[PDB]
Amino acid sequence: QLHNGLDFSAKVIQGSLDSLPQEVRKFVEGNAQLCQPEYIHICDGSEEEYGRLLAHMQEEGVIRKLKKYDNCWLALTDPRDVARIESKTVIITQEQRDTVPIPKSGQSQLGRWMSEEDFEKAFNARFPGCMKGRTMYVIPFSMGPLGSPLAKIGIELTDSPYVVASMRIMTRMGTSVLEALGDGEFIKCLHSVGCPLPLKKPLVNNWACNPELTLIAHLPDRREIISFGSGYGGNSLLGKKCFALRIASRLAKEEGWLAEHMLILGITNPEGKKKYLAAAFPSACGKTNLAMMNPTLPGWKVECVGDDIAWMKFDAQGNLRAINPENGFFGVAPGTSVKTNPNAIKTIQKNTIFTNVAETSDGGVYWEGIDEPLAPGVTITSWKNKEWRPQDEEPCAHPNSRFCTPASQCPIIDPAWESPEGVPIEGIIFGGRRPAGVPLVYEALSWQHGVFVGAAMRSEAKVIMHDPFAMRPFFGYNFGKYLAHWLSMAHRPAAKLPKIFHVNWFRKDKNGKFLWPGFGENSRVLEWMFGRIEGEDSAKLTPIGYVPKEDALNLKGLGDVNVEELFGISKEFWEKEVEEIDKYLEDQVNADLPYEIERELRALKQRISQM
Ligand SMILES: [Mn+2]
Ligand SMILES: [Mn+2]
Ligand code: NA
Numbered sequence: 001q002l003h004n005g006l007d008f009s010a011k012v013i014q015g016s017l018d019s020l021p022q023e024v025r026k027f028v029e030g031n032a033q034l035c036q037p038e039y040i041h042i043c044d045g046s047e048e049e050y051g052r053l054l055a056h057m058q059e060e061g062v063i064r065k066l067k068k069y070d071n072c073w074l075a076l077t078d079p080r081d082v083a084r085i086e087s088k089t090v091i092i093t094q095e096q097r098d099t100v101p102i103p104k105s106g107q108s109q110l111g112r113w114m115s116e117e118d119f120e121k122a123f124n125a126r127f128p129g130c131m132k133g134r135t136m137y138v139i140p141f142s143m144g145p146l147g148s149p150l151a152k153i154g155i156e157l158t159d160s161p162y163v164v165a166s167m168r169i170m171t172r173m174g175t176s177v178l179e180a181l182g183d184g185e186f187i188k189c190l191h192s193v194g195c196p197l198p199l200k201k202p203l204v205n206n207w208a209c210n211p212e213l214t215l216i217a218h219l220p221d222r223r224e225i226i227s228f229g230s231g232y233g234g235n236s237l238l239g240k241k242c243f244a245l246r247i248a249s250r251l252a253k254e255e256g257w258l259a260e261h262m263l264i265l266g267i268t269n270p271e272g273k274k275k276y277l278a279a280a281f282p283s284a285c286g287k288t289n290l291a292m293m294n295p296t297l298p299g300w301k302v303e304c305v306g307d308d309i310a311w312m313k314f315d316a317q318g319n320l321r322a323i324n325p326e327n328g329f330f331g332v333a334p335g336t337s338v339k340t341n342p343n344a345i346k347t348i349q350k351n352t353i354f355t356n357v358a359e360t361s362d363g364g365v366y367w368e369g370i371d372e373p374l375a376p377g378v379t380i381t382s383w384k385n386k387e388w389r390p391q392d393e394e395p396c397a398h399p400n401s402r403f404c405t406p407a408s409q410c411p412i413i414d415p416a417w418e419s420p421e422g423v424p425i426e427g428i429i430f431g432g433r434r435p436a437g438v439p440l441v442y443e444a445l446s447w448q449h450g451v452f453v454g455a456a457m458r459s460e461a462k463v464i465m466h467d468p469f470a471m472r473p474f475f476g477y478n479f480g481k482y483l484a485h486w487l488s489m490a491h492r493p494a495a496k497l498p499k500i501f502h503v504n505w506f507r508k509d510k511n512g513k514f515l516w517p518g519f520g521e522n523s524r525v526l527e528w529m530f531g532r533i534e535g536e537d538s539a540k541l542t543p544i545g546y547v548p549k550e551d552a553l554n555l556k557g558l559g560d561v562n563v564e565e566l567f568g569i570s571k572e573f574w575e576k577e578v579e580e581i582d583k584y585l586e587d588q589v590n591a592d593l594p595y596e597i598e599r600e601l602r603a604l605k606q607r608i609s610q611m
Contacts, residue, residue, distance in 0.1 A: 008032045008040055013135070014049070015042025021183050024155055028138055031157050031190055036129045037136035043164060045140075045174015053161050061206040062162065063353075067363030070350035074365070075162060076383055077232060077356055081209035083400045084234035084241065086473050089216040090114040091246065093477075101480045101592040109466065110479045110588055119217055126194060126213055126228045133197025134159040140178045141171035143244055143311075143325035148420035150257075150311050150323045152248070153181050156189035156238050160208070163191060163236050166353060169328040169404050171239045187223050187247055189238040194229040205385065207231065218242060220250040220476060233330060233355075233402060241474060244309045244325045249476035253485050257313035261470045263291035264306045264322050264423065266414045267526055270299030275530060278310050278322060278498075279429035280470040282459040286505055286518065288331050292343035292412055295523030297554065302523070303414035304343075305423055306407075307331070312425060318494035321422035326407065333357050333401045337371035340519060347410045348403045356383040356401035367397035426533050431503035432459030432467070437573035438504040440516055440566045441525045443532060443539060443546040450500030451486045452600035453545070456581045460506070466584055480592025487596050499533050502545070507566060515566045517558065524554045542569055543607035571611045578605045 001007065008029050009017055017025050020042070032040060043049060054073060057063040066072040090112045091099045100111040114122075137158050144151030156167065167173055194210030195203070201210075214229035225242040227235055234241040248259035262278040281287045291307035306324025315321050329347065333354065336344050348354075358366035359381045366380055374380075382388040382396045390396075407413060416423050430453055432438075444450035454469045466472065468479065475482060489495055503525060505518045528548050531538050539546035547567055555561055582601060585593055 013039045035131035037131035039135040042138045075355045078204040078207040080211040088214045091218045092119045104587045130192045131159045141173040145418045145420045154187040158191040189225045245474040246476040262310040266303045268301040275426045276423040277427040282467040296520035297523045305414045305417045318496045319424040323422040334367040335369035348405045352405040356398035358396035433506040435508045444500035447490045448596045480589045484594045574608045
């Protein structure tokens with residue numbers, strides 16, 4: 001160089017730019033030149049670093065220590081920055097059709113495309129100088145067990161220590177990742193809260209964000225994730241949704257594998273047999289509940305591999321092998337109780353960061369549906385930092401409030417949850433919240449029918465909406481092409497295609513009362529699936545697929561469960577259902593709907609027409 005402007009060595013407060021692989025230095029230094037951070041901190045992922053970072057956030061008023069627990073912390077956000085924001089989440093490709101099918105109605109529910117030229121303008125209006133007066137943290141992270149053949153590495157730059165702490169929990173991060181990477185490829189992840197110093201606008205609740213300029217972008221062809229303006233969860237912790245679902249699903253398409261919005265659990269029966277199952281559910285359908293369920297059936301065990309995301313690839317033997325690419329759980333707090341999720345309660349009592357929950361007088365946590373009384377004298381501070389009484393109209397915790405907790409701490413974490421080869425998936429479960437019409441459990445008639453069942457997924461938001469594969473907000477590319485990708489798995493010689501099931505825990509009677517007790521009782525449905533995978537003759541054929549035979553389900557210990565209503569299938573309901581599915585698929589998928597999905601649709605309408 002001719003002057004002193006391109007070498008950022010003098011500003012490195014941890015690590016060394018010289019030590020980084022060539023491409024990692026270029027990524028760091030080039031974005032330092034653009035964002036103008038005061039300091040550069042190359043994260044080592046050590047306990048020392050983590051402790052120091054947390055104490056600093058505490059010293060700044062960014063987080064509070066929760067004194068009741070072992071090393072637990074609370075962040076309360078600006079009320080404007082409280083969730084993943086779909087409307088400001090976009091994917092950039094040369095052609096719109098590579099990102100979303102072109103809808104007949106003109107508005108796609110299946111993603112949000114932005115042109116390269118539009119994004120460049122948006123980028124230029126946000127990032128130049130954005131980290132002025134702040135530290136740029138460099139987070140080297142692995143998605144998946146370090147050195148799993150299914151693992152992928154990222155480098156996230158961020159000006160938020162909250163993101164650093166949370167990424168330590170949610171990914172494998174630090175020096176060993178940099179050493180594992182070498183000169184290999186990595187996903188480029190750029191994040192800024194968008195508040196350069198001196199601050200141009202008021203800081204609310206010591207929580208830096210820029211709501212008006214919030215934009216979460218994915219550029220799969222450039223292997224880049226670029227996120228600006230939000231410090232919250234899926235917007236800022238770039239490994240989780242942006243990388244592990246959006247970028248990864250496109251990589252999966254390119255490379256022959258699957259990046260899915262699925263829990264992974266291992267279930268052991270009383271005959272000492274173990275099987276792994278994956279499950280894709282939409283929001284508020286008991287996903288974490290199922291992943292760390294304690295079964296009510298004696299002699300059965302459930303163990304948790306992951307509660308959110310699965311990366312799956314068929315091996316040389318034809319087994320569908322899955323890994324959890326995450327290193328922790330980022331769960332919705334409200335509704336987490338000893339009765340709904342006792343294992344979550346045990347997990348989150350130490351080494352956990354909470355966001356937007358209430359705090360009790362003795363330094364504990366509180367939220368709606370915690371179902372745990374407080375001793376007289378103990379008072380509650382809401383997530384809005386105000387004194388709170390259960391007589392108030394507003395909740396003590398934000399509905400989207402979170403815990404962020406180490407996976408290793410789950411008392412029923414699966415012994416193979418970090419196995420680099422992954423676990424063999426023998427069943428895949430789709431499901432949604434449906435008050436009417438949809439039986440407790442059915443089984444797809446074939447792989448193609450199963451792909452159709454995923455494609456047709458609907459769930460009560462009240463309004464029933466489509467969430468195919470529970471991937472609606474997360475498709476990395478054209479949904480029609482994603483369906484074709486799924487269907488292509490049947491044409492792999494020797495592929496062992498898992499059995500596909502659909503579940504509905506949420507069927508109500510004519511009064512609005514749930515017909516199924518759920519929770520640990522769901523083990524009875526898992527038992528049925530287990531037997532079906534073993535080839536048990538325990539099914540009855542219906543127009544929608546296989547259901548449990550009369551007396552096939554274990555209902556002992558339950559009272560009088562209304563099986564007729566729970567498993568009832570109405571021609572009138574399913575006529576309406578199939579018509580709605582048809583209209584949705586025609587509109588939203590159009591020219592990109594695979595022939596086999598059109599065929600399954602026709603086949604279902606025909607079976608229904610014959611009842
Ligand atoms: Mn999720
Ligand atoms: Mn085919
Ligand atoms: Na705060």
